[PDB]
Amino acid sequence: RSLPVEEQPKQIIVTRKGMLDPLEVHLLDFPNIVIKGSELQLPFQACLKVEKFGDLILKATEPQMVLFNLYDDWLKTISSYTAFSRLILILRALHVNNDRAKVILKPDKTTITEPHHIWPTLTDEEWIKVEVQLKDLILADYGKKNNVNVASLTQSEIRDIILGMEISAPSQQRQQIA
Amino acid sequence: VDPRQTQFGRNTLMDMRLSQQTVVDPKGYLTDLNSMIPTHGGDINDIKKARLLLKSVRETNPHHPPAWIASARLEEVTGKLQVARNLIMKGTEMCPKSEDVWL
Amino acid sequence: LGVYLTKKEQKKLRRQTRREAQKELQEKVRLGLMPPPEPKVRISNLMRVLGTEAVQDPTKVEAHVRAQMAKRQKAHEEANAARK
Amino acid sequence: ALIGLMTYFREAVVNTQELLDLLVKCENKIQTRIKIGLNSKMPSRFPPV
Amino acid sequence: LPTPIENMILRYVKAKADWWTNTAHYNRERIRRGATVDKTVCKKNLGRLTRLYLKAEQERQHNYLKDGPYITAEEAVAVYTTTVHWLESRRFSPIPFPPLSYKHDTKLLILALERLKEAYSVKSRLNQSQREELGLIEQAYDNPHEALSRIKRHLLTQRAFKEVGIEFMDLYSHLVPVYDVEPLEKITDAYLDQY
Amino acid sequence: WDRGIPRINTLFQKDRHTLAYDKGWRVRTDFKQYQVLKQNPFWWTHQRHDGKLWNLNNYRTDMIQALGGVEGILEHTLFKGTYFPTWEGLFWEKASGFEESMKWKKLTNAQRSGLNQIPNRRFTLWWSPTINRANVYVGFQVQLDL
């Protein structure tokens, strides 16, 4: 209701199935907005692990509403699609380790984060290298906690690992179907 | 029905946020004196599920005037105009300082 | 003196020339003279052609797509400059 | 068709004793059509459920 | 075609036409009585009766055109005078042309378009003609004033119209004519009927 | 509520203002037989203008009561074979996800005719414990090969 109609959303994606009915009830005046559940767990809960969010909200003495720009200056050099893809990758890495990932996020001692924004300022190829390092980091725990080789991961399932979709099958006896 | 007719012819919000080199932008919290959303006739698909969810809202936030307003107006669009009066009366018993519920 | 072919006749001539060039390219690709054409990818097209590889290395994919876009723009400006 | 006829007349049905026989004959024809669709050989004790 | 060959072909056509007419009438009487007949037989018989009825209608229209109106001038004058006297007695003001600033020019258009869409109220697979008609109705609803202007233009200046198709609903006791009109003219006719 | 010939329902109809400008609707409905190729059983009345002059709530209620209710009806069906704990949170799917997709895929007349009998194959499955019986179909029985 605060935002104008031009900036009003028309597709709300919810990362938890529990907040599908409450949104439908509270969006009862906005039938033209589709509320979509996400079966893949996006790493949006790991942004509070960032140094600029945790301590900021722990010591907030009163409830309030704040605005951040998760795309610091990427939009000036890359489109929002690549910005969101690298943001999802970074958040997945932070959710995975938050210890080695913080080391990866700064590649050189000369890379600093200005107080204006959250992520450090890097060159384009520097961001490429950081992203490939973080992809290796994200594949590392899948290789470890699942005892599988990273090379055994096809390009189709690495994408599922990054996004956050996983499958299990306790009932293998259903092999009777074939 | 219209006065001349003869034989032969919702879930409002009390929270507002005005939007306007710092990472933190605490935007002011505003409260609207009254909010009367149109009835939105027929916008509800599952009447029973919506009724249960609005009951849940009333239980979790008894001091939320929009909850009572939407819960009773759902009975008014349904045609059960008698339970809506009871819902508004209970809301007044639980939200007496909101002039919207009294109106 | 010279003669003026009509608008329909111009359309037929242009269509035949374009089809001739297209068939030339298609038979070159058939016989392996030229490499098979790559999909033309723009920014709005990036998530349809390079979607599965843009989650693993998003910025490398963006750089590759923008390099292809520039090369398409590079050839156009090069032809314009050489013709001028 | 049946609801149209019955809700149009609503009183003339009871006195027209030929209409009752016509209606039950038509209902039997429809049920026989369904039964033949289910199986070529007609049933003996088909249920009304 | 040589004359003897044409003559024998004409004899064959006459014999087959006599058999065709007799068979069509006999089958129609069988169906009317209640004879148990198949669906293909019913369709063929309906086609034969449609052809016979349309031939008879062509004969009747040609007779009317050749023999002129069948109402004598005295009878027409008597009918018209009676109607005029009735209208004068009741003080009837003639229905004017629908004004461009008509207070109900849009409500009547919506009512007319609703009737045209009632044929599609039951969900069904749409062919090209049905979806064209629905597109025309939707276009008229989206721009009511352009549709109204086109309707008034047709009412003022349109005196020639495209051919309308005819089918026959077979009630097994008689044939009910069914007319398919162009949707573009259908909108104008529906608005005119409502008004 | 459902008493008068112009049912009191019609006074509360949402489109009660546009219908007030609808005149000659009964004559038009009667004359609709010359434009549509299907006979209308309710040629004499309009649901919007005249209301719904009948109700089948009591009829269906007594039909379920006479057949023994849900328990009595569903003993005739394969419902107990589905092992659904209860009949409450259940819904049918009138057309299959693929069967409905074939309604428009350029099928021949023979190919389309056989595809319009798919729902029957489900109906017979629904009432199989009762249709496929020795009492109703007297004669020998053949068992399936597997």
Place this chain on the structure above:
Amino acid sequence: LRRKAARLVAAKCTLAARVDSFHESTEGKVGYELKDEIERKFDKWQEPPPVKQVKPLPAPLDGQRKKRGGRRYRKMKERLGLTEIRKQANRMSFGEIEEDAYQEDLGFSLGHLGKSGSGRVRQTQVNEATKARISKTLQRTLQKQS
């Protein structure tokens, strides 16, 4: 075939009149040279239609045929694919008897649309990709009418 004949005869008569106004071809060589071609055109118009071979029905098709995909295919799939409201249309609640909606057709039913149990709190919206609009050639006629 009389308006076309009138146009052709008028054009040829204009040519003959232009010839005659200068008193050229007194005998009538141009007049006959135009009359015989008028008769030739009349014969051509009334010529019997030629022999056209009957196209046999295509053989029944078996196997796989590769079909392309793209913006056209995406648009066609969006226009023809199942919509959410049309997905709810073919879902009928089990055991919950619903009152008849449409008087003229008792078979018609909304299904889960507008009825409890569908699981959707808010009303389903219309997929605007399924909008009905006129053909391209029907747009041309509207350009020739206004």
Place this chain on the structure above:
Amino acid sequence: EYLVSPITGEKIPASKMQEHMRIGLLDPRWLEQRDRSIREKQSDDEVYAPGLDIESSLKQLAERRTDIFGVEETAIGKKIGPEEKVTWDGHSGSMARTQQAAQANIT
């Protein structure tokens, strides 16, 4: 007269200009289409009987249906107004005897 070609870059007689433009841009896929339309036409079989077969069949039918043709009227199938061929019964046990009987019937 002579005119320059806007389609070929050559000089042509003025009298052939119309035909020169008409057939100088004859789309070669028209020739391909005509070729594939004639290749299928040559390979097409004869669905119906030839004239001789039609005539012979009509006479054979007339020789039996004497309620339509002829003067005298016998039954529907009668033609009015030794050796019996041995035929296999479709059984594998009688293949040899039927084959030998067919052989034994040769004069």
Place this chain on the structure above:
Amino acid sequence: SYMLPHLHNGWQVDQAILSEEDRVVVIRFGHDWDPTCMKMDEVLYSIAEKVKNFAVIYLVDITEVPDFNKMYELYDPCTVMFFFRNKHIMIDLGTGNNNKINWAMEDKQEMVDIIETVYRGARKGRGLVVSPKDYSTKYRY
């Protein structure tokens, strides 16, 4: 009847069934003069050209060619039989006799549907095809 090709001996029927490798051979056993056979043959002639791509229709006179009367039980007034790649194809017509069509069909569309179903099933390798229409009843009402 007098337009469709005619087979005059058992060897010709053998060759006609053997010759076609991608089309279903439709053979009408009967007599030209039989009224049931005339109706069946005129329907076949009506649909003869439309099914050219996937069917060939021949006519065999059982009196002239009694070679297949014993095995195929060609004793009904009219009989229509389908073969594919030298293999008789049965049709679940619902009449109790799946080996042949032994009656005259009025509608020309139903015969096209039967031929199309036979072609599909036989090309899939089946020896029995279920007809789109159940002929256990003439649907007369």
Place this chain on the structure above:
Amino acid sequence: FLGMPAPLGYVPGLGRGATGFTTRSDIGPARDA
């Protein structure tokens, strides 16, 4: 081919792998051993 005499000593059933069928026992001549 069409209009070709049958070769002498040829069984129409044989040379094609044909197999008969019996819908009942009341139709066709009795089987001969």
Place this chain on the structure above:
Amino acid sequence: SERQAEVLAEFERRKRARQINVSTDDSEVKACLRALGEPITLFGEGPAERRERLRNILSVV
């Protein structure tokens, strides 16, 4: 491989054929064919087929 060489030769022959100017007059085409020796007609070829054959001959020649 000589197969690649002959495929390239055929392709360049066709490419040259696509840029050879050939008269559209049937009489001049027949005169040119008479001059170059090849028969006027081959297996009932049409005038367009004659034009194609002349183009192919001029391409090879």
Place this chain on the structure above:
RNA sequence: UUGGAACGAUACAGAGAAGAUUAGCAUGGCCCCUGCGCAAGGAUGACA
């Protein structure tokens, strides 16, 4: 060893469902827009 049956028997298999399925790009059609080339043609600014 030598005969019955061979339209049978047995062995294997049995989804007897339903299908020319489906993703990407380019071509082609249309309307712009931008740049360059080609053939011409407008209007206009400039003293000693």
Place this chain on the structure above:
RNA sequence: AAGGUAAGUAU
């Protein structure tokens, strides 16, 4: 009396 034949490979 029926309209109640799975079809397919293999000997």
